[PDB]
Design a protein around this ligand. Structure first.
Ligand SMILES: *[C@@H]1O[C@H](CO)[C@@H](O[C@@H]2O[C@H](CO)[C@@H](O[C@@H]3O[C@H](CO)[C@@H](O)[C@H](O[C@H]4O[C@H](CO)[C@@H](O)[C@H](O)[C@@H]4O)[C@@H]3O)[C@H](O)[C@H]2NC(C)=O)[C@H](O)[C@H]1NC(C)=O
Ligand SMILES: [Ca+2]
Ligand SMILES: [Ca+2]
Ligand SMILES: [Ca+2]
Ligand SMILES: [Ca+2]
Ligand SMILES: [Ca+2]
Ligand SMILES: [Ca+2]
Ligand code: NA
Ligand code: NA
Ligand code: NA
Length: 353
């Protein structure tokens, strides 16, 4: 016999050199197009190696997604300046994703797995319809991201169309769900044309006021409620989340969800978030170390902590200086009240913002 190999990177180049002469053709060919806006080659070996790596990561993603009609291209900030201008490419060494009439400024991990998962998400339709019990339960079980759900008469409702337009503005980062089924709406407690917004990790939704809602009303509401009290650092959005600091610091909690102590600590964090949900000055970033294996050594060294145990601290975004709460693993984890008390102590006397 033979034994067929697992798929492997084949070393065939698929990433397109996008330029003035071909960019129109390239957009016609692909339903989803990912473009890396990058700088011309520097004379130093290090920067050249960095670009070499990035381009190869794109090549791998390009091979994986070839059959699904996702295209990958490079736009040189000098050689292709006019193209960049026309497409709105501004952020140096950054990935932009195009689908129909939407442009996405990718602000996530530059890795093949993360990029492929993201682009697969981009390919999906912007609104998820709930009809069956399995789908409803799936909706209800989402906690680690903001989600919206609306009840409409049918797909031809002017108000469903507005909801879908809003959904496209945030696709694929914020899931929008709809139902046309009165029995599903009843379980969700939605009146016709009502839209419920669920903050991450919050049990109770907030209804968008003044229904029926225009596209703008929905987009306005989502933008105002973009930052959850507790938010998870996710590969797909990590840079956006981190760059959104609270007056120069982040409260950061490490917890491994799959670990007994990590799970318990997460439940405590959720309680803290719930009890402070209307405090616009509070945002905690939850990082599950299991999601970022390549950063664990760095974090353990930089923060001087053991990531096999739950941690909570405050980090200065300018220099990564930090302070972490002492917890004895021979004792029970701190209560939500204890955590809040500690945060108050640290943020009151050690913050001159
Ligand atoms: C997060 O971390 C950053 C550190 O990377 C930190 O910013 C630093 O803050 C210090 C505070 O001491 C800045 O230094 C002072 O800034 C004041 C501004 O008013 C100056 O007057 C000071 O100069 C005086 O002090 C100097 C000695 O440090 C003297 O040489 C000078 O003549 C005056 O006496 C001094 O510059 C420091 O420069 C910044 N560095 C930055 C911003 O990069 C920030 O405080 C931390 N943020 C939080 C929220 O904790
Ligand atoms: Ca190019
Ligand atoms: Ca994704
Ligand atoms: Ca209701
Ligand atoms: Ca309205
Ligand atoms: Ca909140
Ligand atoms: Ca990762
Ligand atoms: Na998503
Ligand atoms: Na700062
Ligand atoms: Na985990």
């Amino acid at each position: 016999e033979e034994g067929l190999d697992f798929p492997e990177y084949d070393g065939v180049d698929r990433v397109i050199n996008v330029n003035a002469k071909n960019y129109k053709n390239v957009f016609k060919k692909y339903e989803v197009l990912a473009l890396l806006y990058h700088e011309p080659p520097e004379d130093d070996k290090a920067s050249q190696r960095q670009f070499e790596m990035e381009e190869l990561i794109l090549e791998l993603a390009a091979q994986v997604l070839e059959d699904k009609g996702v295209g990958f291209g490079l736009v040189d900030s000098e050689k292709d300046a006019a193209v960049a201008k026309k497409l709105g490419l501004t952020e140096e060494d950054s990935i932009y994703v195009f689908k129909e009439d939407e442009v996405i400024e990718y602000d996530g991990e530059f890795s093949a797995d993360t990029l492929v998962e993201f682009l697969l998400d981009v390919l999906e339709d912007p609104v998820e319809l709930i009809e069956g019990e399995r789908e409803l339960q799936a909706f209800e079980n989402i906690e680690d991201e903001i989600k919206l759900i609306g009840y409409f008469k049918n797909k031809d409702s002017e108000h469903y169309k507005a909801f879908k337009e809003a959904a496209e503005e945030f696709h694929p980062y914020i899931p929008f769900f709809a139902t046309f089924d009165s029995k599903v709406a009843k379980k969700l407690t939605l009146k016709l044309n009502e839209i419920d917004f669920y903050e991450a990790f919050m049990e109770e939704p907030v209804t968008i006021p003044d229904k029926p809602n225009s596209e703008e009303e929905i987009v306005n509401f989502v933008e105002e409620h973009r930052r959850s009290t507790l938010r998870k650092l996710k590969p797909e959005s990590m840079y956006e989340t981190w760059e959104d600091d609270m007056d120069g610091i982040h409260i950061v909690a490490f917890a491994e969800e799959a670990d007994p102590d990590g799970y318990e600590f997460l439940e405590i964090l959720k309680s803290v978030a719930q009890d402070n949900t209307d405090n616009p000055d509070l945002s905690i970033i939850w990082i599950d170390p299991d999601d970022f294996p390549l950063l664990v050594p760095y974090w353990e060294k930089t923060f001087d902590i053991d990531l096999s145990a739950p941690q909570i601290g405050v980090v200065n975004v300018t220099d990564a200086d930090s302070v972490w709460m002492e917890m004895d693993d021979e004792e029970d984890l701190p209560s939500a009240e204890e955590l809040e008390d500690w945060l108050e102590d640290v943020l009151e006397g050690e913050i001159n913002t």
